Amino acid sequence: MVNAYEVLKEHHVVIKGLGRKISEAPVNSEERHALFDELLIELDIHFRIEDDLYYPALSAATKLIAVAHAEHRQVIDQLSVLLRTPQSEPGYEDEWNSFKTVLEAHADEEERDMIPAPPEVKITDAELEELGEKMAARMEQYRGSALYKLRTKGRAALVRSL
C-alpha cells in the first residue's frame, strides 16, 4: 500500500524532472514543445488530485488550504503570461524561467506546509494509505481525461481546464 504523501512526493519528482528536461532542451525545439505539453498534463492532474482528494482530507488546516489554493492561482496566472510568448520570440526563455520560478514556489510551499499534514489534521497511517490509494487511482483517471482533452481539443482547451 502507498500513502498520500508518497503519491504526492513521487509525482513532484516527475514534475521537477519534466521542468529540468524542458530547461535543458533547445528553445523552440520539437523536443521542448512535446515536453512542455507533458508538463501541462502532469500539472493538471497534480492540482486536481490536491483540490479533489488531498486538501479535503486536510481541510482542518483552513488557513494553509487557502494559501495552497492561492498558490495554485499563482501558477495558473503565470502560465497564462507564459503562453502569450511563443518559444520563437526573444523574451521566451525569460518567461519560462519566471514560470519555473512560480512552479518551484508552489512545490516548496506544499513540501513545507502540507506534506505531511499540518498538526490541525488528525489523520492516521491507515487513513493516509486509503487516501493514497484513492489518489493514485484518481490521478490515473485524470491523466486519461487530460490526455484526451489535449489530443481531441488541443493545448488551449487543456489550459482552460486548469
XYZ file of C-alpha atoms in Angstrom:
162
model
C 0.000 0.000 0.000
C 1.097 3.540 -0.937
C 0.150 6.546 1.178
C -0.968 10.025 0.256
C 2.418 11.627 0.968
C 4.335 9.210 -1.253
C 1.873 9.732 -4.114
C 2.395 13.482 -3.985
C 6.148 13.440 -3.410
C 6.810 10.971 -6.231
C 4.638 13.000 -8.585
C 6.571 16.143 -7.592
C 9.735 14.344 -8.722
C 8.080 13.686 -12.097
C 7.081 17.341 -12.474
C 10.511 18.593 -11.401
C 12.139 16.216 -13.842
C 9.996 17.491 -16.698
C 10.893 21.043 -15.650
C 14.580 20.180 -15.864
C 14.274 18.402 -19.229
C 12.344 21.372 -20.650
C 15.031 23.790 -19.420
C 17.738 21.606 -20.988
C 16.108 21.269 -24.414
C 16.818 23.890 -27.120
C 14.376 26.772 -27.161
C 11.610 26.144 -29.742
C 12.879 22.618 -30.430
C 10.365 19.902 -31.237
C 11.575 18.099 -28.120
C 10.873 21.105 -25.878
C 7.346 21.559 -27.269
C 6.452 17.924 -26.510
C 7.987 18.085 -23.025
C 6.066 21.256 -22.283
C 2.754 19.614 -23.210
C 3.682 16.671 -20.985
C 4.315 19.061 -18.089
C 0.905 20.680 -18.570
C -0.762 17.268 -18.322
C 1.095 16.390 -15.149
C 0.440 19.820 -13.607
C -3.287 19.494 -14.382
C -3.611 16.175 -12.630
C -1.430 17.223 -9.656
C -3.586 20.234 -8.859
C -6.744 18.237 -9.423
C -5.882 15.428 -7.019
C -4.834 18.060 -4.472
C -8.096 20.005 -4.839
C -10.363 16.975 -5.080
C -8.911 14.495 -2.554
C -5.850 15.681 -0.632
C -6.979 19.088 0.598
C -10.466 17.866 1.620
C -8.783 15.256 3.808
C -6.629 18.054 5.259
C -9.470 20.579 5.490
C -8.886 21.228 9.214
C -5.868 23.347 8.201
C -8.098 26.077 6.853
C -5.523 28.888 6.527
C -2.965 26.620 4.822
C -5.632 25.267 2.455
C -6.461 28.846 1.486
C -2.768 29.525 0.901
C -2.483 26.356 -1.190
C -5.412 27.317 -3.437
C -3.940 30.788 -3.815
C -0.606 29.222 -4.819
C -2.495 27.259 -7.492
C -3.805 30.566 -8.847
C -0.239 31.884 -8.921
C 0.842 29.042 -11.185
C -2.231 29.320 -13.406
C -1.895 33.087 -13.782
C 1.803 32.849 -14.641
C 1.041 30.073 -17.145
C -1.282 32.491 -18.957
C 1.576 35.001 -19.273
C 3.968 32.292 -20.494
C 1.534 31.107 -23.161
C 1.362 34.613 -24.636
C 5.026 34.349 -25.736
C 5.812 31.727 -28.424
C 9.061 29.837 -27.920
C 10.485 31.550 -31.025
C 10.190 35.061 -29.500
C 13.314 36.648 -27.965
C 11.983 37.017 -24.420
C 10.659 33.442 -24.188
C 13.433 31.960 -22.048
C 12.970 34.793 -19.535
C 9.255 33.943 -19.409
C 9.899 30.219 -18.947
C 12.280 30.909 -16.083
C 9.679 33.148 -14.444
C 7.110 30.374 -14.781
C 9.548 27.759 -13.483
C 10.181 30.042 -10.506
C 6.473 30.246 -9.656
C 6.165 26.469 -10.116
C 9.053 25.877 -7.701
C 7.406 28.273 -5.222
C 4.241 26.173 -5.292
C 6.151 22.934 -4.740
C 8.220 24.437 -1.913
C 5.170 25.793 -0.071
C 3.449 22.407 -0.373
C 6.507 20.471 0.816
C 6.963 22.920 3.697
C 3.403 23.287 4.919
C 1.236 20.442 3.593
C 3.310 17.215 3.420
C 2.965 15.706 5.999
C -0.376 17.073 7.096
C -0.375 20.088 9.442
C -0.925 19.338 13.142
C -4.544 20.573 12.957
C -5.188 17.474 10.858
C -5.963 14.291 12.775
C -5.086 11.594 10.247
C -3.860 8.068 10.872
C -1.438 5.953 8.882
C -4.357 3.781 7.773
C -6.330 6.842 6.670
C -3.254 8.060 4.759
C -2.964 4.720 2.968
C -6.607 4.648 1.866
C -6.311 8.247 0.699
C -3.086 7.416 -1.126
C -4.770 4.534 -2.912
C -7.710 6.727 -3.988
C -5.341 9.477 -5.123
C -3.219 7.101 -7.215
C -6.347 5.787 -8.961
C -7.851 9.216 -9.477
C -4.583 10.592 -10.857
C -4.672 7.846 -13.488
C -8.256 8.743 -14.359
C -7.322 12.435 -14.544
C -4.328 11.750 -16.775
C -6.638 9.926 -19.151
C -9.065 12.828 -19.361
C -6.235 15.378 -19.660
C -4.655 13.328 -22.477
C -7.989 13.057 -24.184
C -8.541 16.799 -23.843
C -5.091 17.574 -25.265
C -5.480 15.066 -28.101
C -9.055 15.877 -29.165
C -9.414 19.543 -28.110
C -5.837 20.902 -28.128
C -3.465 22.674 -25.776
C -5.662 25.745 -25.291
C -8.536 23.562 -24.098
C -6.215 21.758 -21.675
C -5.113 25.108 -20.272
C -8.661 26.480 -19.968
C -9.398 23.436 -17.751
C -6.750 24.296 -15.135
